[PDB]
């Protein structure tokens, strides 16, 4: 646990700091992919096994792939062009980032939960009846959302 847990958490936070700090868009996306790998390992550690594999497949494997495809079609790696820098906003921004965690830290501080449940691994074997069933309505809503998203992107690019 804590031996490798500290490692995973340190890598997670370091990768987030990179993805928000690095100006190389490609390197930021790569730090987020590393973050996704660390997070899929964490997921499996949390007895969610199917979810970690999809997190690698969809999030890293697919989403940031399209991100990279966009930033490679449109170079954009040296983002600092057309600056309007607002330099003083860089520390001020972090201030808000502090608060947005601290109050969360306050809401989660002194919070102890019963972390004892035999999830039996987050395998899809048990998620099938939960998805198609109690979640079938949310599932179909999600499917319509994606179909509409395809149509939206098509009509959005659509040079004609």
């Amino acid at each position: 646990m804590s031996l490798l847990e500290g490692l995973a958490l340190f890598l997670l936070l370091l990768s987030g700091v990179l993805v928000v700090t690095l100006r190389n868009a490609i390197h930021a996306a790569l730090a987020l992919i590393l973050n996704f790998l660390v997070l899929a390992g964490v997921y499996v550690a949390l007895d969610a096994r199917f979810l970690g594999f999809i997190q690698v497949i969809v999030y890293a494997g697919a989403i940031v792939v399209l991100f990279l495809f966009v930033i490679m079609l449109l170079f954009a790696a040296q983002g600092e062009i057309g600056f309007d820098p607002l330099v003083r906003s860089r520390p001020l921004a972090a201030l808000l980032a502090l608060g947005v965690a601290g109050i969360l830290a306050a809401g989660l501080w002194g919070l102890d939960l019963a972390f004892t449940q035999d999830l039996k691994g987050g395998l899809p074997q048990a998620l099938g009846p939960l998805l198609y069933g109690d979640w079938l309505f949310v599932l179909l809503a999600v499917g319509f959302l994606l179909m509409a998203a395809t149509v939206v992107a098509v009509a959005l690019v659509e040079p004609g």
């Binding site: 969360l104 809401g107 319509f144 959302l145 509409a148």
Partner: protein, 427 residues
């Protein structure tokens, strides 16, 4: 069994647009919205729930209003891109799903499903439309991330993602705040108000009609399920109404001024959330939807890109009935007797006083009295000397729609004890 109608029409049209001209697709969309509206009415007093989808008076009323707004905004859209209709359908269905569930996650999926087609409909490709779409999408995804962490902390304070749970102390309050951020952003409550002026100014006028009516309607439909604490509600109302009216004082363009006014009006509607009466808010939103759809239908008859305040002037001489309906709308939104805006405003203030928040109510009333300055500077401008201004005096479509909106506004303002008896279970 209305959502099924919506889904069937949308999915069939998605392919039928390849064989049907965009005008035929427009007729089809209109038929679907009218059929869904009629199916909603025939189910008045018949709450129907299958899964997390749960229809009560709130779902019924707010989806009726959303369907009205969609019908009206589709009447004007005449572009030869059948997609420019399909998206509208989605939003309606999406907003339906927003008012028809208590499940926080299905609430998020419904929010995304109703909001995404708005991003694409806002592209007349005018350079301002791109800027508006960008601000809208970025701030909306930010609010969706906040709302999602709020649903997560809700699941943390309680084993279910459905509202109404007993609730813990700091963690439940924090989850409530992270939900309220997104919900007030969607309802254009300050200090989340920034996006609304820019988006209303940039988007094509009929789309702004659809937005300022149905989006705010469904947003408050979702808010009514939340048990927002009084301190947060008071802060939102104070900041929203103050900035709304004050920043509207400085506005030089009709659409931006109306967006700030809608921020102030969401601030007013946020009073009925004190009790979650769903009768006060249903009535208020009925009147607001009618009046604002009327005003934006007129503005679309003037100009889709942008309309300054001077363009409104001389409207009575140009078209008498149009100037009269515009005056009715300005006063109803001012909430002045004998117009229904007075009854909606009073019902919200009565809910607020019943909850026992007094100073907030006084500040809201002072800001509403300040609002009369520009409400009159718009309503009374109709009679002024006509200056150079593009004027498209609509088809009989938009004339009849505007007339019906104003007639319903005055009819329900004069005798509100007609429908107000049936805003509960529906006797």
């Amino acid at each position: 069994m209305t959502l099924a109608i919506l889904a069937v029409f949308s999915v069939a049209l998605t392919l039928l647009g390849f064989v049907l001209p965009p005008q035929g697709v427009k007729r089809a969309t209109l038929l679907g919205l009218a059929l869904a509206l009629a199916s909603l009415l025939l189910t008045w007093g018949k709450p129907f729930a299958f899964g997390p989808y749960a229809v009560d008076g709130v779902s019924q009323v707010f989806t009726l209003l959303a369907l009205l707004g969609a019908l009206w905004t589709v009447g004007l859209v005449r572009s030869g891109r059948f997609e420019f209709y399909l998206l509208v359908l989605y939003a309606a269905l999406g907003m339906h799903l927003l008012a028809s569930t208590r499940h926080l996650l299905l609430m998020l999926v419904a929010l995304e499903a109703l909001s995404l087609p708005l991003y694409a409909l806002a592209t007349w490709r005018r350079g301002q439309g791109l800027e508006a779409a960008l601000k809208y999408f970025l701030l909306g995804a930010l609010a969706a991330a906040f709302f999602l962490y709020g649903a997560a902390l809700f699941y943390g304070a309680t084993g279910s993602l459905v509202l109404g749970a007993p609730g813990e102390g700091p963690l439940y309050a924090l989850a409530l705040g992270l939900l309220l951020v997104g919900l007030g952003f969607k309802a254009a409550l300050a200090p989340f108000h920034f996006w609304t002026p820019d988006v209303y100014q940039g988007s094509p006028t009929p789309v702004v009609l659809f937005m300022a009516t149905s989006v705010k309607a469904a947003a408050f439909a979702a808010l009514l399920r939340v048990a927002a604490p009084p301190e947060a509600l008071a802060l939102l109302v104070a900041l929203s109404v103050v900035v709304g009216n004050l920043a509207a004082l400085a506005q030089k363009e009709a659409k931006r001024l109306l967006a700030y006014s809608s921020i102030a009006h969401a601030g007013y509607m946020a009073l009925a959330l004190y009790t979650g009466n769903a009768q006060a808010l249903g009535f208020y939103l009925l009147t607001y939807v009618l009046a604002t759809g009327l005003a934006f239908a007129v503005l679309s008859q003037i100009s889709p890109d942008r309309v300054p305040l001077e363009a409104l002037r001389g409207l009575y001489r140009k078209d008498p009935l149009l100037g009269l309906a515009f005056l009715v709308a300005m006063l109803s939104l001012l909430g002045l007797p004998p117009l229904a805006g007075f009854w909606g405003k009073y019902l919200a203030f009565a809910e607020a006083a019943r909850a026992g928040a007094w100073g907030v109510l006084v500040l809201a009333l002072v800001t509403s009295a300040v609002s009369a300055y520009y409400y009159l500077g718009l309503g009374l401008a109709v009679f002024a000397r006509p200056e150079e201004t593009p004027f498209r005096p609509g088809p009989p479509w938009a004339r009849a729609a505007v007339v019906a909106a104003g007639v319903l506004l005055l009819a329900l303002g004069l005798l509100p004890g007609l429908v107000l008896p049936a805003l509960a279970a529906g006797g």
